[PDB]
Amino acid sequence: QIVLTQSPAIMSASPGEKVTMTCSASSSVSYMHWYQQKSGTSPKRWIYDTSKLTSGVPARFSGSGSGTSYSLTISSMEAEDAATYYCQQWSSNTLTFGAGTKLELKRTVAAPSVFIFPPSDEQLKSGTASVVCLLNNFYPREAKVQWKVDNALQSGNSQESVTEQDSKDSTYSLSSTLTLSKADYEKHKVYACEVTHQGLSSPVTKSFNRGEC
Amino acid sequence: EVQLQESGPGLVAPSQSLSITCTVSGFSLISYGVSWVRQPPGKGLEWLGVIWGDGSTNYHSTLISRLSINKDNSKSQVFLKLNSLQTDDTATYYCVGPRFAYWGQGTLVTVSAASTKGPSVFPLAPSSGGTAALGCLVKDYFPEPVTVSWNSGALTSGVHTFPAVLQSSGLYSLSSVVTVPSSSLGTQTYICNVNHKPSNTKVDKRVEPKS
Numbered sequence A: 001q002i003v004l005t006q007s008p009a010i011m012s013a014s015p016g017e018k019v020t021m022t023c024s025a026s027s028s029v030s031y032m033h034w035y036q037q038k039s040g041t042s043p044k045r046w047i048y049d050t051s052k053l054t055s056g057v058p059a060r061f062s063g064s065g066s067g068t069s070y071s072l073t074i075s076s077m078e079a080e081d082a083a084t085y086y087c088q089q090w091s092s093n094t095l096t097f098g099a100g101t102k103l104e105l106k107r108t109v110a111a112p113s114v115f116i117f118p119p120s121d122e123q124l125k126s127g128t129a130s131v132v133c134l135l136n137n138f139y140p141r142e143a144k145v146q147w148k149v150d151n152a153l154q155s156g157n158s159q160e161s162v163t164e165q166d167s168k169d170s171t172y173s174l175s176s177t178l179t180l181s182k183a184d185y186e187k188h189k190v191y192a193c194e195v196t197h198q199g200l201s202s203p204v205t206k207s208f209n210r211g212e213c
Numbered sequence B: 001e002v003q004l005q006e007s008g009p010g011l012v013a014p015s016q017s018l019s020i021t022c023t024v025s026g027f028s029l030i031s032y033g034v035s036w037v038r039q040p041p042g043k044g045l046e047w048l049g050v051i052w053g054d055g056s057t058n059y060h061s062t063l064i065s066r067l068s069i070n071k072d073n074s075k076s077q078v079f080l081k082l083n084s085l086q087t088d089d090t091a092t093y094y095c096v097g098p099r100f101a102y103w104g105q106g107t108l109v110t111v112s113a114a115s116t117k118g119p120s121v122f123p124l125a126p127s128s129g130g131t132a133a134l135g136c137l138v139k140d141y142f143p144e145p146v147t148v149s150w151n152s153g154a155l156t157s158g159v160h161t162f163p164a165v166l167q168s169s170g171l172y173s174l175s176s177v178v179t180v181p182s183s184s185l186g187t188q189t190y191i192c193n194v195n196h197k198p199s200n201t202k203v204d205k206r207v208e209p210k211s
Helices: A121-126 A182-186
Strands: A004-007 A010-013 A019-025 A033-037 A044-048 A061-066 A069-074 A083-089 A101-105 A113-117 A129-138 A144-149 A158-162 A172-180 A190-196 A204-209 B003-007 B018-025 B034-039 B046-051 B057-059 B067-072 B077-082 B091-096 B107-111 B120-124 B131-141 B147-150 B159-161 B172-181 B190-196 B201-207
Touching (some): A019 A101, A069 A083, A113 A190, A113 A204, A121 A129, A121 B120, A129 A182, A129 B131, A144 A158, A172 A182, A172 B172, B018 B091, B018 B107, B034 B067, B046 B067, B046 B077, B131 B190, B131 B201, B147 B172
Antiparallel strands (some): A019 A069, A061 A069, A113 A129, A129 A172, A144 A190, A190 A204, B003 B018, B147 B190, B159 B172, B190 B201
16 A cells, blocks of 8 residues: 655666656655666566666666665666666565656667568458568657658558667667558559658658559 | 466457466475466566465455456466456466466466467568578468467577567468578578467468479
8 A cells, every 4th residue: 555656757867977866655664665677678676675686687777775765777778778667665564666667778769671571462462552661779769750652651551660679779669650552552553751851851652652562 | 497387268258257377397386386377469468377386366456356366286277367358458478387487388378269260371482692581471360479480490690580460360470581691592491480389370481482
């Protein structure tokens, strides 16, 4: 029943910056623990008993606090530190977690490399048509994709998703799929994905012509 | 070392009870407690309960009426049972060993009346000293998750496997890509290995430049 409130919800730090996140409890706690979680993996015990580091954790991490006030600090932000951090307590019968602090590495701008993929003949033979646009290794995360078919703007028939920040180069990638019936795909020629991003002085268009091998 | 492995249904109908097994190794279940934690997609961590060495149990107050945890010490097995299911019980469920320092890999359980469906895997062929991109589209499967590797794990550098999207049909679609030197497209073989455990559907799809 002890509520843990973490702050900030989201933060970005440049390499070498000192990072501090906080966990405040609704009632006094004897010890605070912290877990790190990265995309597609179980949470890892990172700090325990308020200020002890699990084996393998870099010494730039530290933890502190007492009573209702705790905090985790990285002396010098590094790319591998980008992740979600959860505080955790078990000073009463019910174990509780904070809602997490999502920590991003703030790097230089990187323009996406843009690639377009027509539907495969296998898919077309199966009876559906998907066109895919990849925006690879860009920063910051904000990016816009517009699909055009014979210069018709497509609205509502695409979906997209984005990877978590890369642990090495701190970039994002984004995949967008435009869904068409086979008949619609086969009755149009030019398929384009137009990308807007801070690293591009003007929107960039990658296109292909259906039927051109 | 201490290991905890979950075995779970993947898809479960809301008319059923969710049942998950956690097989442990490396520590005594008679001496140490084992906890269950869950994480809905895109959300935080929630502790469900614990079974202690002597068999006593503690549950999260909000869910105490729905949860039951038991165990078999001789088999080193812990059993979670969640009743009164709703779609919002869809989550990754973890068993957690002593000191909360060892976690299972987690099993994604989906609560739905829909049926399981394995994916179709289509190539994203590299377009016709230069970087090229290729990939595969894992289309029309249910429930989550799908895993993707490349060349049986021999190819990891440059790989991006994206979050799945839920199509209007109620089926998921996922893409995985990799960037490689353009000069390798004619001499290296690229295979994406797709596993949809909820349907026991596995595919290995070769991706090559179009002829």
